[PDB]
């Protein structure tokens, strides 16, 4: 299959050729704006697997994400209270770089709606993700049976709530039951189940 020969190639990323092609691309992207649109994605087999069908109302934006751990935004590095919290340049955040790369497209471009993103290049500095978006107002979409669900208002900003695949990971939702009991359906939901004090009417 065509998809195979192409997909088995992207699965050797460290090879001399996929090291070289990737290198020129890291260069070219490094010199471009954070958010930039492509006519068509750079991994067309991966964009489709993640949902990109070539139609009207299908967009692919590349994004930059500066990498590295998170330095807490506290003035002059001075944190008060007791020493357990005293660290800076020490926490790792929680959201992925990817879940940020989808939320970067979250407020900058309001009309679009986000499906999924995928890894593209990686440097000593930035990390690029190509985000696949879609239009609620496109006629080819509303009349499409498969994606017209995205037109519903419930999906309006679905990256900002962590509903995309990058947002489902850091919420712990890939492991289903017993590897996550306490975080499902969401930590705040399971925390509120367990921490209510419930009073049966007849005690």
């Amino acid at each position: 299959g065509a998809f195979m020969y192409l997909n088995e190639l992207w699965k050797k990323k460290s090879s001399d050729v996929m090291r070289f092609i990737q290198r020129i691309r890291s260069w070219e992207f490094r010199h471009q704006h954070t958010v930039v649109r492509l006519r068509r994605p750079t991994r067309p087999e991966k964009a489709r697997m993640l949902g990109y069908k070539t139609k009207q109302g299908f967009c692919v934006f590349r994004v930059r994400v500066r990498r590295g751990g998170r330095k807490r935004p506290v003035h002059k590095g001075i944190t008060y209270g007791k020493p357990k919290t005293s660290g800076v340049l020490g926490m790792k955040l929680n959201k992925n770089n990817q879940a940020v790369a989808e939320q970067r497209l979250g407020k900058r471009f309001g009309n679009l709606r986000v499906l999924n993103s995928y890894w593209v290049n990686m440097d000593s500095t930035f990390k690029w993700y190509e985000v696949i978006a879609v239009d609620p107002m496109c006629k080819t979409i509303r009349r499409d049976p498969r994606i017209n669900w995205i037109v519903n208002s419930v999906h309006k900003h679905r990256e900002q709530r962590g509903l995309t695949s990058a947002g489902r990971k850091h919420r712990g939702l890939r492991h289903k039951g017993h590897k996550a009991s306490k975080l499902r359906p969401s930590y705040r939901a399971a925390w509120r189940r367990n921490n209510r004090i419930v009073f049966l009417r007849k005690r």
């Binding site: 009073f199 009417r201 007849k202 005690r203």
Partner: protein
Amino acid sequence: RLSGMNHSAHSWGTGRAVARIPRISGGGTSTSGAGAFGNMCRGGRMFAPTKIFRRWHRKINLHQKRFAVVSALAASSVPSLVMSRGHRIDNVPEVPLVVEDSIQGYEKTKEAMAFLKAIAAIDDVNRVNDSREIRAGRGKMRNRRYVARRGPMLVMPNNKGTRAFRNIFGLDLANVSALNLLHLAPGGHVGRFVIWTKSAFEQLDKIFGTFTE
């Protein structure tokens, strides 16, 4: 939960020559510097604010609920208790007064009246009817205007047959399958005057059971 609380109040402290309670902060109003955040302060909290999670509803053993109704009926068959429990019972032909099953056939209410006058029960329903007054209390303003004495409940086995009695002042219809203490011994006092219909009065042996079976 926020009642008697929303204020910026703090305490002035010692050295101001005044009590140490918290005081409202601001100026130019009549309540500036007035006391706050305490049950003593005009308008503070109540002492220990009431809650919705008070224990409102008590469980009762299923058995004792049965024992209690059973025990409440044995008091309905005694004319001496019923005398002092308050019902007139003067001309009542017999203690477990019992009537026909046709009583469910009435439709106009005018006929169910001359029924009650026939088994003499019209003397008690004139105790309920002449006792209606406006309450002494605050209950008037709550939605309870009038007090009535409790009347001669009538027990009809099927739900049907209600009508012909519904507007009678003070009479309480009840099914046999469902009998509750609150109408058999209202006020906790036992021996209400009951009127059993013939098909109802028969059901008891097979509802409440008997000794040994």
